[PDB]
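ingest -> validate -> predict -> emit
validate: passed (alphabet ok, no gaps, 132 aa)
predict: started
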Amino acid sequence: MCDAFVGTWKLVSSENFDDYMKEVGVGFATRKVAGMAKPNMIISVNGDLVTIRSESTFKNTEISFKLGVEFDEITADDRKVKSIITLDGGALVQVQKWDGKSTTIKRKRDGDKLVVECVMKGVTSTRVYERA
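emit:
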């Protein structure tokens, strides 16, 4: 399950992430620190349970979830959201909802890369990772 995604992934490019975080409502100071962080993303699977960690000097976070089962999450920027993650077309698609708002984070394998596209109200950021 989700075999392709398993690994340790290091950030290699980031496009439009500051504007994405502005749209989400992340504060100035936090955007500054989060933008200069170069997180590793560590994805593992155990039976039907998927775990994603994001590790950086900014913060360490971890979510554990089942596909297609809504779960509560505190994000790196301290939002309390309801999240649902699904496998569609080989991409892992995460929707976060809070306070009448919504954002989508898509993680797709493209060659030897993991491409992460984050969208909120038509503002899109793209972050590309490769295996560490």
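The chain has one domain: 7-131.
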